[PDB]
Design a protein around this nucleic acid. Sequence first.
RNA 1: AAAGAAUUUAAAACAUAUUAGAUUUAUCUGAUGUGUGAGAAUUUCUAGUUAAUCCUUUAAUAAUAAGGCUU
RNA 2: UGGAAGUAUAAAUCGAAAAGGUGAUAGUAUUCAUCAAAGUCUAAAUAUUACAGGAAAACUGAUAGCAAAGAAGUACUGUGAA
RNA 3: AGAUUUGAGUAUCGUAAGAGGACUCCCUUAACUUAAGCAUAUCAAUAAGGGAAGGAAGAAAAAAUAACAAUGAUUUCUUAAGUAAUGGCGAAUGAAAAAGAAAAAGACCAAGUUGAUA
Lengths: 148, 204, 89, 49, 226
Amino acid sequence: ATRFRQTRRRRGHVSMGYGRIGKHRKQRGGRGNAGGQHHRKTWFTTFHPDYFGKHGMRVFHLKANKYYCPSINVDSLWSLVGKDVQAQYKNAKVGEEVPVIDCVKHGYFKVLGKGFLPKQPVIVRARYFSEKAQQKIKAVGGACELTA
Amino acid sequence: GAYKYINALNRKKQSDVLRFLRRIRCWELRHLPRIHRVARPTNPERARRLGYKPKSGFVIYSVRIHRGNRKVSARKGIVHRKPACQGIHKIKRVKSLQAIAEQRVGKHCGALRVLNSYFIGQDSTYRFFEVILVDPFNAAIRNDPKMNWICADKQKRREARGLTSAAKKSRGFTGKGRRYNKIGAGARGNLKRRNLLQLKRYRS
Amino acid sequence: MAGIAVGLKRGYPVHTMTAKRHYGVTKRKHVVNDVIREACGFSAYERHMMDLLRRGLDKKALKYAKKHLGTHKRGLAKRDEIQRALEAI
Amino acid sequence: VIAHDVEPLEMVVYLPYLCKKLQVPYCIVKGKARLGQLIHRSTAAVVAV
Amino acid sequence: AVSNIHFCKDWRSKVHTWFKQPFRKIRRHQTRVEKAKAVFPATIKSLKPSVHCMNQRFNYKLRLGRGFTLKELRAAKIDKNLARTIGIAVDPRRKESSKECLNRNAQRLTEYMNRLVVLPKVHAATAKRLVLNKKNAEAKTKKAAEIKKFIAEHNKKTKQFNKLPVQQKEAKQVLDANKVIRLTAPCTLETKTLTKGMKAFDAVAHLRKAKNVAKAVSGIVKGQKK
RNA sequence: AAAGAAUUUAAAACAUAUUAGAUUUAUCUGAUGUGUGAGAAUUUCUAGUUAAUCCUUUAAUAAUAAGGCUU
RNA sequence: UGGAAGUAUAAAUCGAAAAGGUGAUAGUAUUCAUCAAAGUCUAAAUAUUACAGGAAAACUGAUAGCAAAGAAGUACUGUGAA
RNA sequence: AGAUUUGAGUAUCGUAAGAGGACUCCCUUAACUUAAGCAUAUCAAUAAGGGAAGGAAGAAAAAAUAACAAUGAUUUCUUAAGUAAUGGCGAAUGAAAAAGAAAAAGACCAAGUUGAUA
């Protein structure tokens, strides 16, 4: 909407809101991130204090697929099957039939332990487990299964 | 098979027998004109591998080329360039001497098609190749279902576009994979595709 | 039920299935090699390598071969190939 | 029987050395055109018995 | 935020606009229709395997591959020479990855071969195959008796190749065979019985034992040479 | 010392034996055969012993080399 | 070249094979995996602001729109490129 | 004399040249500019110079990826991704496998064998 810009409101003003003592000239200190260590050092120190330097080891060819590991906490496990199934198997214990949560089928590899689980037995099938994740699943009456 | 021994023999180029024969051939080609037709290939094993067939329409041409390196063609070695580009010596041609010699033969014989070429010998000054040429308008070549691909229009001056094996190697088509990421289907075409700024019709 | 995703015994349980085909040569290559070697002989560096091997400088024969071939494994083969020529002679 | 004037010589040079290994008798005569008259051709690189 | 904008080169000659996009649909769709009218079996987009994706990030998913291996055709009793003529993709470059891949893609070929209806090479009713079927039809009936029996009672040498299903039927022209034979059956909620052993299985220790075993091979080799 | 069922049918690599051919050279080429590799223990823990032990070189290790982290 | 103890090409020298190449940190060894270079061809999906023929347009409406809405690359200038 | 090899003249039937080069495949070591100076770097396979093509061209059937519950010629689009990496590690430059689609197609020489050989 060019009719809502500031240019339409500054017609008749000589400098178009840019100053008379200091004009609107071509440059204001260099093109791009110029002068990162001479006259814009106070900008990089103030707002990007670790911009210049090196840190860590180079990975010549990083295989980004080997670091892929989606995570889900324990409190969010039941949302995979919904509250309808959760209430159905609310009154189960050892011996009878218990729902299985397939984290891998939903795209989750590692199960972390955060928050609180409902007080029902459940079987959790996944690729990795945290120490506190297995504790919270076992403390509620469930079992942990590995995959892949 | 006779040609399984010639191929094994031809791999011993540093033997006394092959060194002496190459000396005579290299001497002979130093006096004959630069580009001239020979009756039959001097290396029939290597000629047969590269597509030569002893039939009508297949001819062999010998070409002598001055090997080594050359200076950058600037007058008196003076260039008005930054010190990064101020080199006159030590600069090497991108195209191989085989590809360069194939273009000289093809330019000389504009009505024939360069099939392939191989190496004959060399000395302190020259290097001698041999170019397999095919006449695309021969009745035998046209009627051969296995060879009339050379009669297509697009094969006019094969060597000058970079379709022969000698000229394709200088284009980077010597292998596949991560080593040849920049020469996928043409080095210059690959660069254009990657640098394209695609502006979809509906964009954020 | 499913395997495990970490360690040596890693992977989903399946029955993985190829043949390490050897790219070799027939028994006639010995005849062809003998025929060509008689008609051609040895190069300058093969001749220099035979002389070093005769004096018992096996390590110097490998260092010389590596210089003229550029590969440690290719230098070993040439050293063994040349020393087999000496034993026949 | 091997002709002495075969060009290039790289095509029949191994024949004396191959026949020497297999104990096959071999002789070298003069003229590939002389051999060719036997088999009714202009030239003949080699002829066996 | 520090800006990283690569417009210093002449982007104006690098700009590609998509004004031809609404007409690619019309071109491709019309050509796709034209091929169907020419030989409708051709546009069927010949059947393809069910191969897993690569890498552990995707390895639990199935996707169509290119071509059945020569072992999968043998398992399904199809000639590799006739396979390409009846809309089957064949990939000799594919090494058989596992027995499960071999079995799963053998069902795909067998199921496709049952839905296949190959028309006679010559439309005339005097074609040899149609005549041949009549000549040996009496042998088929007695053959179909004993096969129907030892199947009905039970529930090492077999035919190398099966028969091509050849007959005369109405042309029900189906544009592709991959969407008729689904890769994966719909996934229901799996559910299991809780046992005492399941409660006791310690998953974390198994993960760390498996990991720590892999990291102690160096300690084994280093101490060996000493 | 204390808890532990482990998931279920279409198979090739060849370590090889034993034969049917050919070969003399660093000798090879088929087929018959069994296991391998097969599935209807494993972990924790206390006391020893041995070994390894700051991270990485992306198929696994090793001694050299190189790169990381702190000063 | 993004390819970093050398990703690709070329030149000088050197130069293999009872094969071997690759697994991007140089080196040697032992396993493992995966291919089999140094000859050729091959439709379809893709590009197009030469040029020709058409159709459209929240484009310009004779100082605008192509330089050119008339005998426009014309009148006119320059030795000439222009 | 005769049998061959090689090289020429002439005759017949043909073939290349020039125009165009928007898109296509290449050769060549520009500079202005940016770095608030500048000398590597950037501009930049960019301008100019040169060659060769067709209605499309180039590429194309693994000495290819990966380390998986594995894929499988080429080409083009989406994503990976302003990411790994490169860089007076400054200014700046910068991919690819996996994965989702359009389309799908595989065949030959050489070498080997058959030689009352054609």
